[PDB]
Paper text:
One of them, ATP-dependent protease Lon, is a member of the AAA+ family (ATPase associated with various cellular activities) and is responsible for selective degradation of unfolded, oxidatively damaged, and short-lived regulatory proteins, which prevents their toxic aggregation. Functional hLon is structurally organized into homo-oligomers consisting of six identical subunits. Following its mitochondrial localization, Lon’s NTD specifically recognizes and binds protein substrates, which are then unfolded and translocated into the enzyme’s proteolytic chamber formed of the ATPase and protease domains, where they are degraded into small peptides. In this study, we investigated the effects that phosphorylating two Lon tyrosine residues, Tyr186 (found in leukemia cells) and Tyr394 - the only two found in its NTD - might have on the structure and function of hLon and the effect of polyphosphate on hLon’s stability and activities.
Other hLon mutants were produced by exchanging Tyr186 and Tyr394 for glutamates (Y186E; Y394E), thereby mimicking the negative charge introduced by phosphorylation (hereafter “phosphorylation-mimicking” hLon variants), or for phenylalanines (Y186F; Y394F), which acted as non-phosphorylatable controls (these mutations were introduced to verify that the effects of phosphorylation were not due to the loss of functionality occasioned by the removal of the Tyr hydroxyl group). The Y394F mutant’s basal and stimulated levels were lower, however the stimulation rate in the presence of β-casein measured for Y394F was almost the same as for the wild-type. Quantifying the protease activity with FITC-casein showed that the Y394F mutant had only about 50% of the wild-type activity. Similarly, the basal ATPase and peptidase activities of Y394F were lower than those of hLon WT. However, the effect of substrate binding had the greatest stimulatory effect on the ATPase and peptidase activities of Y394F. Altogether, this suggests that the Y186F mutation is largely neutral, while the Y394F mutation has some downstream effect on the ATPase and peptidase activities, which is largely corrected by the binding of a substrate. Cryo-EM maps were obtained for Y186E, Y186F, pCMF186, Y394E, and Y394F with resolutions ranging from 2.9 to 8.5 Å (based on the 0.143 cut-off of the Fourier shell correlation curve). ADP could be clearly resolved in the Y394E, Y186E, and Y394F structures. Structurally, only the pCMF394 substitution had a large impact: the cryo-EM structures of the ADP-bound forms of the Y186E, Y186F, pCMF186, Y394E and Y394F mutants were all very similar, while the pCMF394 substitution destabilized the formation of the ATPase-protease hexamer.
Residue numbers in the entry:
A (entry chain D): 464 to 649
B (entry chain C): 526 to 587
C (entry chain C): 650 to 949
D (entry chain D): 774 to 949
Amino acid sequence: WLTSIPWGKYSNENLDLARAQAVLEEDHYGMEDVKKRILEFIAVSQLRGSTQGKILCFYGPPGVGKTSIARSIARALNREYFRFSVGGMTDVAEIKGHRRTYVGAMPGKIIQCLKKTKTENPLILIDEVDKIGRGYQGDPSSALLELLDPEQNANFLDHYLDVPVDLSKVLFICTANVTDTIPEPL
Amino acid sequence: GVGKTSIARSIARALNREYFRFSVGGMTDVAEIKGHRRTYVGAMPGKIIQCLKKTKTENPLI
Amino acid sequence: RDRMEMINVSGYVAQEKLAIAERYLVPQARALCGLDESKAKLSSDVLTLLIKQYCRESGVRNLQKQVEKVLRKSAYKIVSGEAESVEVTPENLQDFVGKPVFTVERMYDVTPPGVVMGLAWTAMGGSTLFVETSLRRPQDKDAKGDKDGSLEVTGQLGEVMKESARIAYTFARAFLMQHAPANDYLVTSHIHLHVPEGATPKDGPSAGCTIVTALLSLAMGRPVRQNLAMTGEVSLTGKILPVGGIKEKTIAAKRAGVTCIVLPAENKKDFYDLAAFITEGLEVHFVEHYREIFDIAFPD
Amino acid sequence: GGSTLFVETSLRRPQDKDAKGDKDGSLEVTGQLGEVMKESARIAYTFARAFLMQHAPANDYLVTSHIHLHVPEGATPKDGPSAGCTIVTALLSLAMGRPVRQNLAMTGEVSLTGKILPVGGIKEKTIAAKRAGVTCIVLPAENKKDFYDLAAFITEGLEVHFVEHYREIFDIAFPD
Ligand SMILES: Nc1ncnc2c1ncn2[C@@H]1O[C@H](COP(=O)(O)OP(=O)(O)O)[C@@H](O)[C@H]1O
Ligand SMILES: Nc1ncnc2c1ncn2[C@@H]1O[C@H](COP(=O)(O)OP(=O)(O)O)[C@@H](O)[C@H]1O
């Protein structure tokens, strides 16, 4: 489980702005603002040199292309793509695995994403963020917060695995039909 | 948005001591402060012990 | 709460925000965007326009987001756009971030009868809330009619706020009795008052003076004097009591483009403990009995 | 996304139980309303009463009448209050019995004084209106910039009417 995790696996990223603009214009219609932000992100990643990653969420009606445009962005940047459905989930354990001591323990779904993507700087897409249950013995919202923390992310870890993970270059996208239901800290 | 955290970092660096933040908002588990029992394999100590480990000094800016 | 010492860190008036942005925000964001002051440049007037229009709260984080966005657009223009350097101007700000948002500094400026400003020390810093009143039943169903005007309150008010409202109602009725017995309006007229929520429960009662003045303005119809605010806990006799968050309310009031402000005499020291520019150009007024407030708001 | 919902009202008890009647016209609200929504509904009720008073003194309908109004659910709670102007105009139309001008919509928050406040989701509301075949639309002046950030075709053939105070609206919904 551990060795299979990448370490310094900075999956190469394209940086030709016009190339990405043409790609996005071909893969989708209108949707200007998203393309504007993406071009800005590419430009900053270039001028800064070293690639990086931040957190932005597309909010709007369902079946509008959010997932499709996320896939197109993953394609254009050349980096990996993975999606994780969070709505109606309580046990952070799935996010954090288990202690690794329970019978048939497994690591948190983010570990599965990292293994399958087999990359250090992938693209992750959280589906339907506002549908978190955060009920009894749940409240993973804390886990998501630490995950999106622009500083704690650099040394995130789970229950099953007990080692820090750097994610500042990881790109995060989040989807939700409505804004208010999202917890304010996120 | 007043810089409370920023001024915390400024004090930490000016004093030459170390820095470590902590979120307790909406929290309901005492364990994080008092850790776990050390008996349940995979049990972890209190976050404060982890901060002491990271800063490696007992005069941090918690 | 009691086991340590509490130190206050409160607000930033437009001047303070401008200084912070010039010396702290813009360089930090530029570094975050991997840029040079030679390549990207923002005039101070641009920051003034941003603060005055594109961000409305005591905090500064939203201003940070706006400046970061404009720097991002400048970076995109640099990497590919024709321009080799960016000199932001009030002209180009529109295209850089878009059309303005907070076009009106205040709710309004007229303050028709039965509405008055007040200062609320809400969790998210200071704010200016208008307390309004209205007559939701005929003033004279029958000139004989002697049943007292019922009072109704809106704003998710807690029982403490409800009692404060009742106290203000009674005191306003008595003050009208003394000042103008011929006017039974405030007595024989069912009335509905709305006090906007968001004030922290402890600070709730502070709006007693505002409620009393609003009720009196409605009774006489005289619109309260413009660009005026106030705050204070009423005593059921007309004496005012001190309140907290004085600095926060003061900064919020100044941000709201208000000139004449009213405070209890007790809090006077706290008002003077502030800076000068923060207190610059404020026709302050310190009182201890409500009569002085009535004289001020209604010069006649 | 956006949607068009018909706020409806009706009289649930004989208007003139007593020509002398001095009771207060009740109000009942349906549609799974949150508490903030109930407060907004009562604010709209009071303002509509006062407006009828200053405008049509002879009409006690709203003052002494047990009215029931249905606001179709679906509005996100934060956006709930946006139907304040809709509620007020519904009550006024019922009071004077005049149907509102056909193919007309609106959205805005009322302030117990007749002033209107900005609202969110302007774009989606505009799309819903356009898909609803409505021609004349009413919005607060404050949101005007948002309505002008949209493409021309989306705004094509929409006779908008920006307003700040409810008075303006009363002149549109009831032209004559
Ligand atoms: N602007 C657009 N350009 C191209 N395809 C679109 C656009 N908007 C919607 N679609 C299509 O509609 C479908 C919506 O599905 P999906 O991407 O799951 O929507 P969402 O991302 O909102 O869940 C997609 O197959 C997508 O190709
Ligand atoms: N007076 C100031 N001097 C320097 N930076 C400031 C000042 N006020 C606000 N800031 C900036 O605003 C940001 C807000 O940080 P934040 O963590 O929200 O602080 P707080 O915890 O007080 O809200 C900080 O990064 C800080 O640099």
